[PDB]
């Protein structure tokens, strides 16, 4: 024999985890995030774009829209820690947002075999966008320069001090 | 050493945050009144509060309670010592000696 043996072998039966005491209870969003509030996106494809907050979803996310006709941001799901909530406010009374949920955004995950060589849209989502944005632009048209404020993009300038700024 | 006259607040905070008993020559965190009832129930003491009482209202069994209490292991003061130089008397601008009622502030910073 090259190596003799261990006289005792450890058990291969796996031990079970103790009962944990970490219950899931909901988020306490900060007081500056109210539906209708205008947000600035800080990360992602649409970083620097101003957008409208509509609904707090179940997976600690915010439902969000450009509206798409204004700046090009569709009905989307974002995270609260990657946005700045401004003081500017819109009224969302008149938008039937109850339809949207975590299942509305499902990726239909990709398989192992499908490797992209070098490099589509759902009509339901397109039409729901056209339904919501028409009710939103009707209220954005009231306050002046707001359609422009949303079509524009946010940027920090020389001298901007975010600890001093107000959004 | 630095010494002085402690208040109920700092006695209570010490015994509740850094509260350790000498059970069979071991440093046991108190964490419950059963330990105290088992090791001091002889001397009428049942709770961490009755212990604090025997401490502050210096009783017949202060010796036994204070010996049961393991020496308090305090950190350094979170805001500092207040002086630039420690090893003069509190009177001469240092830290040692009797700081009669200013010991509560230091101990709370250290606990």
């Amino acid at each position: 024999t090259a190596q003799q043996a261990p006289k005792w072998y450890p058990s291969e039966d796996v031990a079970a985890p103790k009962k944990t005491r970490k219950a899931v209870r909901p988020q306490k969003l900060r007081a500056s995030l109210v539906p209708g509030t205008v947000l600035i996106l800080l990360a992602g494809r649409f970083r620097g774009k101003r957008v409208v907050y509509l609904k707090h979803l179940e997976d600690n996310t915010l439902l969000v829209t450009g509206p798409f006709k204004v700046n090009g941001v569709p009905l989307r799901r974002v995270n609260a820690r990657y946005v700045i909530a401004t003081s500017t406010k819109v009224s969302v009374e008149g938008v039937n947002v109850e339809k949207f949920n975590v299942e509305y955004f499902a990726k239909e995950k990709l398989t192992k075999k499908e490797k992209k060589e070098a490099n589509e849209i759902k009509a339901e989502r397109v039409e729901d966008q056209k339904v919501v944005d028409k009710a939103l632009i009707a209220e954005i048209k009231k306050t002046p320069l707001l359609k422009q404020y949303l079509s524009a993009s946010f940027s920090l300038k020389n001298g901007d001090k975010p600890h001093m700024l107000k959004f | 050493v630095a010494y002085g006259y402690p208040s109920y607040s700092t006695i209570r905070q010490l015994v509740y945050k850094r509260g350790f008993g000498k059970i069979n020559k071991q440093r046991v965190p108190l964490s419950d009144n059963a330990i105290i009832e088992a090791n001091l129930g002889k001397y009428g003491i049942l709770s961490i509060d009755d212990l604090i009482h025997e401490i502050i209202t210096v009783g017949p069994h202060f010796k036994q309670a204070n010996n049961f209490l393991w020496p308090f292991k305090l950190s350094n003061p979170s805001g500092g010592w207040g002086v630039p130089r420690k090893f003069k008397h509190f009177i001469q601008g240092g830290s040692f000696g009797n700081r009669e009622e200013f010991i509560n502030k230091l101990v709370k910073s250290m606990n």
Binding site: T1, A2, Q3, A5, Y9, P10, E12, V14 | -
Partner: protein, 127 residues
């Protein structure tokens, strides 16, 4: 397939090398304690090499485990391998260095049949 284990921690992945194994060829790299009266390494002056001590010891839960999570067991034949039949999730076989190529085939076939992991299934393979 390995048994679940924690993250493996080492605390010193660098080999403890003898003082002046870089300076003299006669001085080998195998650790020797400096026993000198004026040794900076023995006295532990700032900026010197580290000395091995028991605080660098590895956790007893993750000791002797390879990164796969198996403990290595040397084997020279199928009978030595079969001791790990009911211990596949804990122990992995290492074929000894002095084993011939034609017997390595047998050991690897039996290990594949019994589900035993082999750390060196490439020694003495021709193609």
């Amino acid at each position: 397939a390995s048994l679940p284990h924690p993250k493996i921690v080492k605390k010193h992945t660098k080999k403890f090398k003898r003082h002046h194994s870089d300076r003299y060829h006669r001085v080998a790299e195998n650790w020797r304690k400096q026993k000198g009266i004026d040794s900076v390494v023995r006295r532990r002056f700032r900026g010197n090499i580290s000395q091995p001590k028991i605080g660098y010891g590895s956790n007893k839960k993750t000791k002797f485990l390879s990164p796969s999570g198996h403990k290595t067991f040397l084997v020279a034949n199928v009978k030595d391998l079969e001791t790990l039949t009911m211990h596949t999730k804990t122990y992995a076989a290492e074929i000894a260095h002095n084993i011939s190529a034609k017997n390595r085939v047998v050991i690897l076939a039996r290990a594949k049949a019994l589900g035993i992991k082999v750390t060196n299934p490439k020694g003495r393979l021709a193609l």
